[PDB]
Design a protein around this nucleic acid. Sequence first.
DNA 1: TTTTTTTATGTACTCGTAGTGTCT
DNA 2: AGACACTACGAGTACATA
Lengths: 327, 340, 350, 343, 319
Amino acid sequence: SKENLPWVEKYRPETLDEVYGQNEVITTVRKFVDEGKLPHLLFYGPPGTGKTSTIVALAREIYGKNYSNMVLELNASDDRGIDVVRNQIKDFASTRQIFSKGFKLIILDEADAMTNAAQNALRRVIERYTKNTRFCVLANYAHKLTPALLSRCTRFRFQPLPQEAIERRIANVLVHEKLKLSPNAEKALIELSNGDMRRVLNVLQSCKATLDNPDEDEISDDVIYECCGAPRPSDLKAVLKSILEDDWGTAHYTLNKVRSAKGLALIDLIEGIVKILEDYELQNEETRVHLLTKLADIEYSISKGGNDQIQGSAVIGAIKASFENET
Amino acid sequence: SKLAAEQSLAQQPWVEKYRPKNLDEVTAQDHAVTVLKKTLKSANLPHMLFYGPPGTGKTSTILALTKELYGPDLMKSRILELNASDERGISIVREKVKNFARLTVSKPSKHDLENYPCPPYKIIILDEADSMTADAQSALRRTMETYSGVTRFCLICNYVTRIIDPLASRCSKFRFKALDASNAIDRLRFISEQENVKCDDGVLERILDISAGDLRRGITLLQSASKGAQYLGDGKNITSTQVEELAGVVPHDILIEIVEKVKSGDFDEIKKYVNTFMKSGWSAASVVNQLHEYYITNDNFDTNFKNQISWLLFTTDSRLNNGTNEHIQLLNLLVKISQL
Amino acid sequence: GDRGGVGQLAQFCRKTSTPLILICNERNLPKMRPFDRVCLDIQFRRPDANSIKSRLMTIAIREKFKLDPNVIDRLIQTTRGDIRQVINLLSTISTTTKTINHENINEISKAWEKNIALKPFDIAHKMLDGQIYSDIGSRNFTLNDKIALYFDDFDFTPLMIQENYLSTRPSVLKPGQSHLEAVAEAANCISLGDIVEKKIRSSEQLWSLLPLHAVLSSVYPASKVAGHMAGRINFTAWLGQNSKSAKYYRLLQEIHYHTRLGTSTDKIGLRLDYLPTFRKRLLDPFLKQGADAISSVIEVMDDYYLTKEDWDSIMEFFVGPDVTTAIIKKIPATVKSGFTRKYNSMTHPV
Amino acid sequence: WVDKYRPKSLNALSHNEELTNFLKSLSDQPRDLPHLLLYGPNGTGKKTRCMALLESIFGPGVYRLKIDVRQFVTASNRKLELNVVSSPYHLEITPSDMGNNDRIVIQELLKEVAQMEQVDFQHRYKCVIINEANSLTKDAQAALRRTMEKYSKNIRLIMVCDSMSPIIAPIKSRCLLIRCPAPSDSEISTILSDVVTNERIQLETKDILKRIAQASNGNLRVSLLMLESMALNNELALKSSSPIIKPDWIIVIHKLTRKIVKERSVNSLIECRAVLYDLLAHCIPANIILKELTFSLLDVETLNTTNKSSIIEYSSVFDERLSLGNKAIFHLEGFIAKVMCCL
Amino acid sequence: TLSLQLPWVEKYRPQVLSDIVGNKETIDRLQQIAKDGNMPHMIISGMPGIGKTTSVHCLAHELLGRSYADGVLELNASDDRGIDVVRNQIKHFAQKKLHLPPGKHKIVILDEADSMTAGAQQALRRTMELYSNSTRFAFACNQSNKIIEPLQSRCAILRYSKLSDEDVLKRLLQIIKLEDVKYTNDGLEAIIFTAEGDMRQAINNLQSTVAGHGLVNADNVFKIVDSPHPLIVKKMLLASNLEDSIQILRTDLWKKGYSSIDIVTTSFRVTKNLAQVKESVRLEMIKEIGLTHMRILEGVGTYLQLASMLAKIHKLNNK
DNA sequence: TTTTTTTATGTACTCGTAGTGTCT
DNA sequence: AGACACTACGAGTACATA
Ligand SMILES: Nc1ncnc2c1ncn2[C@@H]1O[C@H](COP(=O)(O)OP(=O)(O)OP(O)(O)=S)[C@@H](O)[C@H]1O
Ligand SMILES: Nc1ncnc2c1ncn2[C@@H]1O[C@H](COP(=O)(O)OP(=O)(O)OP(O)(O)=S)[C@@H](O)[C@H]1O
Ligand SMILES: Nc1ncnc2c1ncn2[C@@H]1O[C@H](COP(=O)(O)OP(=O)(O)OP(O)(O)=S)[C@@H](O)[C@H]1O
Ligand SMILES: Nc1ncnc2c1ncn2[C@@H]1O[C@H](COP(=O)(O)OP(=O)(O)O)[C@@H](O)[C@H]1O
Ligand SMILES: [Mg+2]
Ligand SMILES: [Mg+2]
Ligand SMILES: [Mg+2]
């Protein structure tokens, strides 16, 4: 049953009408498939934007419920070498369909992990067999694809999901589930997603499990922040104010109590302070240079471990020494 | 059978003897285990990614969850634990992991469905995912995305940055918090009571203070102090000094001597005292930590001096985190902080 | 390799009753090493311009094609000594343009330039050329060409640069910077390129960092010290030193695994500490006690399960003021003969 | 010799009575013993104390050990052959004898000994002594991270090292940490008096022994070996002004420091590179070379505080570089060039 | 949706050498060669999407007439092209007897010749030298440096260059006239701008815009095709103020879904191929970009790292 | 004017013991 | 019934890598 799948998998779009966020790409793809002129597609975008869902719904619209048989779907989980290309892809492109009449579809999902020899062998398979089959390449990084292979497909850039699309999907989920969400909680949820539907769905499931009730109550910002362990804007601005204004000992005590009372992480506080100070209008850019350099160095050091107290004191001292030049 | 396991647990180190067996024994990591308990009644366990400092209980939490889910019978047939002591290249991920994910779930017995929920999926846990190469990690993407109906993936790591962004997006992130004195004093007192550890007032809270968010190291230090107190047989209580002497902490007088040498003195006497101090084996990480605590918490230095001391201690810790020579780094730090 | 027809032909070159002529384009190759001293080597070099000029005049008047002798020199120097490519160029361009004297030769040379990879010694010369990094030479030999120079052979270019970057006379010294400062900056960038190369050829196979290793290891240290070549371009000696150190590490590992039963120390802990005393225990009694100190040395080497080969290998680790390469020759041959004779006589418990 | 006079039990130690009492405490109940990590200066006597602790956990047969040969196959046709020092109660592994293939040996051998149960006709577990855990790369340490916890009833690790800097935090947490401080000059002189009384050495003055201590920097392995070495030059009778025999590499490093402080040029940098090559080719680690060269450069009285500060700063920088690199000469020559530019 | 139509890149693929709008010199050379015969061994190199494969295909077709099926041996990178293939099949084709007109020869087309192994390339030398009177070889590659010098010495070298805006505009106008598509001057200019001398990419973007919006306008072209990636990176690196470069990186690159790895790689490539600044400044910028890339590859790829890279670049430019 | 370097997956070549259908 | 050409799956050896 579908009631056992996680929310990321349970709410996977099955038709092109359930893929929000991408409107310029979805409409053009629908027109491609309606007029018949469907070229080789290259869906390039960040993770969780809806490329795999889009191509699956497209193949479903093209072939019907018989998608899993009339389409050759290869991914990084499967062995994709030059011999794999030579045999499988060429034999799939050269022959005809077994169940119906129509062009074939080769979905090379996550093709950014393919070998250079495989792409060099495939670039002439795409150009030779182009009247009976098609190629759709999904990618997160366009630098791992050879320019020859990159020039044979129509490139569609999947932009990060905007506010309206994620809010629409959240409303759809809140209709599908017996769940209520606060407005400010919804805004905070949009803020910690960066256009990733997977993260939104996962944390929504986690906060629904966190409610500890039969779901007669509403999900507030406190529930979200305690679920994802993210710092609140209130504590963020309090720590920033204590660093900028209060003394060294006072700022140290404030940072310690804020990061120990809620169990917050230093990397999350660093990211939040960076996001907040981005709107700060300052004097000569030397302070910004010092701030960015020292904060990136501290982040790279945190990414490898060490003493958390030493790194917190380093963050405080770096911010103070950077703002000491803005006078 | 059961009695043999009880005796083996009773004759094991306190780290493994008091390993949490249920989702209730975990004390401080409540936000994650609340969701884990609420999903135990449901059947929609998502792909999970545990990350946090070492010794916070990630492996213990996932083991207790798998136990409470499957029972001690299906625990050995519906799990796939892949640790860092095994090969985890592209070949392994493509053959073994994918074959296990494509497998159907094992049929539960009659006794399993009576006491345990027995969800219709299995769990493939990957401990220490930091060592997994980026290509072997990207290979897991569709493996975990298409076979989610029959298997569930649980990644465990310390540095969440070592895992690629798509895998971190596919899994729900559970951040395990550092176990300081406040949220682990209950567990430490329970461990001390179960072992009749006669300690003083401010010992346990001090132990975790030396642990810096690590309950395993705290339990090990408690076991060492208990052994050292039982060998003597004096019947007294363990003191904070007896704990800090075996934990690698530099005494306060030796630290005051270092502060006096840095405050007053030139390169020569500082170098001589550093050479003499390195004879007595102390970990430079603990020395840097104590110096940072002393310099930051003291209300006797200027803010301009405090920013510089913080940056210098940060640089020294970052250089020590790469396996450098402790003597050279400590001498360089003390000299740099001696020059105003 | 070890198996192949190369060695078979090399051995055939020793026993034959019929003339055996061999033709190859690259002589100084490792696979061509067995042919070093077995066959008479003849080198065909760059042909002279006069004979090629006469041949071109002939094939031009024969093919109804106009050509002046002033262009043949440029054709040859762009072709870099290949009459075949010159003939193909004439046959290809003659079908449309029947005359090429001084007007269309620019595009002809720019379109038929021989893009050949330089030897690992010519890359060292071009990298350390001070004119290339000048303000005029920079916009002629661009940075892309400098990186392609390294990419011609990315296995020796960093080593060749690190070998002879401090053996030149710099001509790009900034005002207020001495030669030592530029050499120190080049060495710092060499260390950074070393870190990058270690990150490249390690786990995770970060080969996409190869262009970066191009700049840090080769381009930047050369630019910092570019100029004239003072002496000769010395080949990188790091390879031979690494081979010697690896062999010595193998020998020291054998010695440590032989005497672990008594020392209970590490390889480095035995090399730094035990050998300065093992030398005076084994070798020193020979210089002061003649040939009657043999039993003591045998007993000492037995107490730690040493061997004759181990004894000979131990004395090769010491450097500086303690070198035994002459001390062993100073020992009377009678003492050494008695020692090696007693070695193959007394039984030794492994 | 340092081997003829070495303690074999806990009651035979002659320094660090607090550490001996702690070891007795830890070996009182031997079956409820966690993993241990002995750290401290090189040459303090931690490898002897580990064997003395095993002699208290088991019978005296722990010292009767044998060296066997074990073979392993990598991902390719390459084969590795390494010698294991095994005993009827424990085994000793030193992965510092190979390159990046230590993780395979670690995982395979440790899983084998974990699944393997001890034999009879000689307690319940079999100890493993990981010698020089600093050479273990992060991959092998990560592989051992879970092996330490999965099999805790049969395999107890006693990891011997000289500095916990390259040891990862999980491994540090997974075992007790025992520091072995280097013995003071008094205890070293006391041991030297006993060994020269047993070896029949003639001393006109006792203070020379103290000087040996002041020449060993707490190291007993260096002190005893240097005493036996200088006893061979003075013909079993040490004088009141007997010279201190320094190792050849130390004298070479001192001469290199002299060449650095006297001349600062590129022609001298070539000779410095040649000396560094000669030192590296004769089985001398580059970290020790850098440490000793920096400490010798700081001892030069011709320089001032401004020079010594920059020297130690460049030394730490290039120490990090060498710890992050593999071509050791590429960092050593850079450090030497930076020092030349500083002076 | 039962059947699809051929794309305009394949449908309007040139079948005669006159329809090629590439380099006029080499095209006229190949035309004269096919008209007179005696086609020599050739190696055609260039960039993707400029008319290299179509050029040699049209040459072979117009040179062989109806005997194309039995006189042309086409081998791509998709087929096995090892030493065994060169030894057996290529040699059997070169030795194969075929009665051709007294001005033609058998042609062996080898697409993507820069991917053949060294053994096959070495074995092909005598194969093409011993049968050079009845078999001719035409290689089509992107990098002439990947082909060994002995092979290049026995053939002509044709280096195809980028297609100027005039040629691509003429070809697009011809395609529009043959398709009757409503367009606009700004739309065609935007297509040429986003093509970057790539004729195939230009035709593909044109067909996409036509089938997605109907009218070829700059608005629709920019809506369906984003601005070129290297140009925005160049504008970001060449910014005079740190705030301008930070705003560019935030809005144009980071807010549009460009990964950090792609951003740092494009920055490295632009700084390498830059010519506005001196060599030393470019070297320091490449050093900083590589220092940032070393952190991006370790999984620390975020916006803060790119911001710090831009700050360090501006500090370097701050004299 | 010249020799070497740890490892990690993909690619290509080679000999090669082996498993089975066929002919003196 | 059996011998031996044909053959195709497997261990070993290198060779690159933007
Ligand atoms: N535009 C969208 N509309 C609705 N749900 C979406 C959308 N994009 C993503 N999702 C959700 O996120 C899940 C994963 O989407 P995918 O298409 O697999 O992500 P992706 O774009 O392929 O990126 P990858 O797989 O990490 S490279 C889907 O099953 C949906 O539940
Ligand atoms: N939250 C906790 N509650 C109780 N005991 C805990 C907790 N966390 C850790 N421990 C103790 O520490 C031991 C180690 O637990 P682990 O789960 O292995 O730690 P960890 O998070 O896996 O650290 P690693 O493996 O180095 S990332 C357990 O067996 C417990 O004895
Ligand atoms: N000069 C041209 N005139 C007309 N159409 C052209 C021209 N060049 C390219 N095209 C179009 O581009 C398509 C593919 O061109 P190709 O010749 O395959 O590209 P290429 O130059 O060979 O580069 P590759 O194949 O990627 S290495 C052709 O089918 C034409 O539709
Ligand atoms: N307590 C002690 N009393 C006397 N000698 C000791 C003592 N501890 C160690 N030693 C000496 O140290 C030598 C071994 O040193 P070792 O333990 O290998 O150094 P490390 O501590 O670096 O492993 C032995 O020869 C032994 O004589
Ligand atoms: Mg996908
Ligand atoms: Mg764990
Ligand atoms: Mg082509």
